Design a protein around this ligand. Sequence first.
Ligand SMILES: [Mg+2]
Ligand SMILES: [Mg+2]
Ligand SMILES: [Mg+2]
Ligand SMILES: [Mg+2]
Ligand SMILES: [Mg+2]
Ligand SMILES: [Mg+2]
Ligand SMILES: [Mg+2]
Ligand SMILES: [Mg+2]
Ligand SMILES: [Mg+2]
Ligand SMILES: [Mg+2]
Ligand SMILES: [Mg+2]
Ligand SMILES: [Mg+2]
Ligand SMILES: [Mg+2]
Ligand SMILES: [Mg+2]
Ligand SMILES: [Zn+2]
Lengths: 141, 36, 159, 176, 140
Amino acid sequence: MLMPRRMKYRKQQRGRLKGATKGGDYVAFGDYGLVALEPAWITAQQIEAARVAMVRHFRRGGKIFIRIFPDKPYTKKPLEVRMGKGKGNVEGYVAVVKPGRVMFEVAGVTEEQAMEALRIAGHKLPIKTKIVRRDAYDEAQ
Amino acid sequence: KVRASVKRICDKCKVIRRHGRVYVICENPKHKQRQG
Amino acid sequence: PKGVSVEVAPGRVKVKGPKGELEVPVSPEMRVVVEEGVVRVERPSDERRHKSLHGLTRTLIANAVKGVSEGYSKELLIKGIGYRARLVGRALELTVGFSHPVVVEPPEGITFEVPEPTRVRVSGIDKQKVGQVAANIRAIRKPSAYHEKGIYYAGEPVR
Amino acid sequence: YRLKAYYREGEKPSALRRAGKLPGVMYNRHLNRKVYVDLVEFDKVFRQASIHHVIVLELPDGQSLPTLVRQVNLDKRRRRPEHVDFFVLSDEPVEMYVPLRFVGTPAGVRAGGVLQEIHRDILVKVSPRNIPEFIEVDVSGLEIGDSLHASDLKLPPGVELAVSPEETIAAVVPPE
Amino acid sequence: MKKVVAVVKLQLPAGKATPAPPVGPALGQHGANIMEFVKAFNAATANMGDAIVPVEITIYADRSFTFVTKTPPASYLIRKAAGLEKGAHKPGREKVGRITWEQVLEIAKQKMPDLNTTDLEAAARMIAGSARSMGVEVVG
RNA sequence: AUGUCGGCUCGUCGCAUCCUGGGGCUGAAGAAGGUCCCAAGGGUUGGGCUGUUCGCCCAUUAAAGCGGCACGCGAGCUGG
RNA sequence: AAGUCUGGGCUAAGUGGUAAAGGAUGUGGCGCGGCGAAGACAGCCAGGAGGUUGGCUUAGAAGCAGCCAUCCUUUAAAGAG
Ligand SMILES: [Mg+2]
Ligand SMILES: [Mg+2]
Ligand SMILES: [Mg+2]
Ligand SMILES: [Mg+2]
Ligand SMILES: [Mg+2]
Ligand SMILES: [Mg+2]
Ligand SMILES: [Mg+2]
Ligand SMILES: [Mg+2]
Ligand SMILES: [Mg+2]
Ligand SMILES: [Mg+2]
Ligand SMILES: [Mg+2]
Ligand SMILES: [Mg+2]
Ligand SMILES: [Mg+2]
Ligand SMILES: [Mg+2]
Ligand SMILES: [Zn+2]
């Protein structure tokens, strides 16, 4: 679950994934966060299936920040149909994700529960992730 | 018993490594892990 | 370290004492002779393989020393009803459960002991050779079924 | 704190890092110069330093310059620094971000709630002689639905606000 | 908290006592008299009051015992002190009722012979905390 | 012009084992089971219905394994 | 056909001689921190308490099903485990 409620075009091209995030490399919300190491399209089903994995772990606790949003229509041709005859129909939605992107980040919880509620979510993702805590980049002087 | 990720389940379980194979020994046999 | 002769051939270092001679196939590495009124053991750079060997030899020969300082020990029980093997000369004789009775065997270099049929320990001059005979007899009968009889060591019984 | 800075005439930034020298640059109305502070030292320093406190540049030629980091540039993937460049300090109305230690453990207790430390610090006009270490925001009268922000801090002598202010400097929100 | 030999502590009310639920098997299991206790108990309960006396009874082979009586749980004196039936379910935030820096001190006096801290501030403390233990804020 | 299903005949290889041989767990009392490991050496029935493969059923059995061989095999047969 | 050529390393799997998530006290080199002769790590001997069985619910819930809080006590030290 988690898809846009609009967009000007129902289907869009596959595009390409050339490394290094366009932004969202620093953690600007919570205490600890989760960052992607390898490029990939994360699915709506995955984002969610990790957001809950997160809460459920530390039930009735902090606040979770999801910083990636599946706004790319993913398509697929029906089964047993042959090539051509127009573009497949929408399957679900994905979010583009390149190396360095801080996807998630938790707030208001112990590092004990952070570096765990994340370790679990990580297993729900199609890629390799790494955990981080606020450091170098901060918005100040 | 037998699996891909062999980890710990006690405060009493050694991560023995015998024969290139990563076994796991604990007091209770329910924790006897191997890797394969 | 007492009445002990510390031979020092290639890897051979056989020691003699009140009971017998005990050779100790030592890894021809670093070398250490009877040197001084006691025995030393040195090694080269701190290499894992050397770290292990040193020590593996160290505590191996010290067990060899007590090879004649008497290292018998290794005692067993038997528990259960008709479980209580007795002695039959410098040879043992087990009797427990099996519809058909069963002996043991003459371990050249080791002596038995049946100070009571409900107790049996082993007279050892070696070591790993005694600890072997232990399990060996220990395993004639496995302890438990959730609970009860069987042969034991000196350890503790499971529930 | 202090940190050993050096001079760059124009030698391959790549070759610099390859050796361990994270490049940077001190500038201001007057001086504008290429430097190359060590990385590990810098990290170890700026680590607990941050753009919050001043640094002294102990160059290869006596000169000991004041410094207030202006922006550290990253490598995106492998969130590690590429260009740490510090502003040379004068004694002019130097804008800067003063930390924000809250302390008080507000409402949101059994109810839960979280301290959304929105904006862990803030920008203001001051002079180098005045390095206002932190500021106060106890917040314990502010529950969940509520939130303090704008003019809600105490401006000690020599520290004025550069906002409106409306910047909701922090708030409290519900659990899971 | 002295010697040990098949002991079995437990709390009891006023004269009311014998129902198997509270006691009964509570000491009859370790072989004893619900007789030599049901009354032997109401021999000191009827004398001091009619609340809740924490009586820990030790046992021997002669189905014997040494029912030592103490002051009611610091959780009782604190309740009625503000008129509260139950505890509070979820403490730390909802103060169903409250007590004063003094009302707490009073009780402290009543249980100081059981504790191990002569001082009346020391004792009162481990009581003021008993508040955060059942949602009953301290007035002060 | 590389004959296409099933059957029959002849097999052989795999193991991701249905029996039988070993072995660790068990919520293993025992006898029985369950699950994972090792292990093809050899075994892996006769019938009713349908062209059937597949299935269901009858009567058993230690078990009535799953596949690859141009969904093996029509210059070997059948031809439903 | 032409170096069992020469220095310096790494690898003990025949890796090399083709695979992933994920596992692991496999080894090697730079590092960061943390404790340490105001005596550390493992160890072995000692203690490991008290209000109190914290409040709720439950047959029962006494640190130790779940829910909430997590203050305070006497100490060399003892978590409402
Ligand atoms: Mg919405
Ligand atoms: Mg590129
Ligand atoms: Mg059993
Ligand atoms: Mg032809
Ligand atoms: Mg197999
Ligand atoms: Mg059985
Ligand atoms: Mg037929
Ligand atoms: Mg027919
Ligand atoms: Mg076949
Ligand atoms: Mg065919
Ligand atoms: Mg026809
Ligand atoms: Mg015809
Ligand atoms: Mg040649
Ligand atoms: Mg590989
Ligand atoms: Zn274990």
